[PDB]
């Protein structure tokens, strides 16, 4: 019974995923949108997220881990705040890969009043 935690940085342009142990100071598997898929336009797709979850599940099985919690985050703060579409797709692809999922937490770093939000309002 080995427990791991997968970090999913889901954006509107990418959904990088890295898998660590409980302490988090050691990583096991990692794969971003462009790590396996060669199109930047399709790096944030749910199909790319399921491909990343599948290609991480076999490495997790090789390392000896069958269950991972999910710590999903958006960029957060002075950028995009809500989680992207790749989070639920990655977690469902992990659950369909055989890897059990327990707790899933949305841990996007939320600022109360952080630095100045870069934006153009209408543009």
């Amino acid at each position: 019974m080995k427990w791991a935690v997968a970090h999913i940085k889901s954006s509107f342009n990418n959904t990088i995923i890295t898998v660590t142990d409980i302490t988090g100071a050691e990583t096991i598997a990692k794969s971003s949108g462009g790590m396996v898929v060669k199109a930047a336009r399709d790096e944030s797709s749910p199909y790319t997220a399921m491909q990343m979850a599948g290609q991480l599940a076999d490495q997790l099985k090789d390392k000896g881990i069958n269950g991972i919690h999910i710590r999903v985050r958006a960029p957060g703060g002075n950028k995009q705040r809500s989680p992207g579409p790749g989070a639920q797709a990655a977690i469902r692809a992990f659950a369909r890969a055989g890897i059990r999922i327990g707790r899933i937490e949305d841990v996007t770093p939320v600022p109360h009043d952080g630095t100045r939000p870069k934006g153009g309002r209408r543009v």
Binding site: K2, W3, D21, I22, T23, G24, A25, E26, K63, R103, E105, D106, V107, T108, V110
Partner: protein, 182 residues
């Protein structure tokens, strides 16, 4: 790379029945020194009721194949904290550092909620009594007993029964209990 780095297990605080949490593998025995382990109250005592809070545990020394850990406080989850906050409920935030019987210093952030939009004066009174009651809990009870009341929820109900007179509190929690000293 992967094969060379060996594996280690964990050991919970003694007051949490010296429980088991997980296994973390590192290259060397001293590499796990100073590594925070994030786990919930439910998993430490295999119960689904206390799941919205994640306890924070710090490695203190690797006793062979087992990594003993120190409970460095808890903190309520972001989603549950944002779920408790609603409309017409002036949440009385706060921050107090105290000294328990053992000499531990704990920066606790006890929070309050109200059934209606509480006035500012009642909020100040609730915050003052909350700070005083947390001070008396820390002074009159040691580290492990007071933190069992805090993490497990005795402190929140104590604040509810000691600070309900000035105004009807909808719900009280201790969202952050960051630990400073030993």
């Amino acid at each position: 790379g992967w094969k060379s780095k060996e594996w280690y297990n964990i050991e919970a605080p003694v007051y949490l029945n010296r429980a088991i949490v997980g296994n973390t593998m590192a290259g060397d025995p001293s590499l796990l020194v100073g590594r925070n382990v994030e786990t919930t109250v439910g998993e430490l005592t295999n119960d689904m009721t206390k799941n919205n809070t994640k306890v924070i545990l710090r490695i203190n020394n690797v006793v062979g194949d087992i990594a003993t850990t120190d409970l460095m406080g808890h903190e309520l989850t972001t989603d549950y904290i944002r779920s408790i906050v609603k409309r017409q409920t002036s949440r009385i935030d706060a921050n107090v550092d105290v000294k328990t019987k053992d000499g531990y210093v704990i920066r606790v952030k006890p929070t309050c909620f109200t059934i209606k939009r509480a006035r500012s004066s009642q909020m100040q009174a609730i915050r003052e009594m909350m700070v005083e009651i947390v001070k008396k809990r820390a002074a009159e009870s040691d580290f492990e007993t007071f933190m069992q009341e805090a993490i497990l929820g005795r402190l929140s109900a104590a604040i509810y029964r000691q600070a309900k007179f000035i105004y009807p509190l909808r719900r009280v929690e201790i969202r952050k209990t960051e630990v400073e000293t030993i």
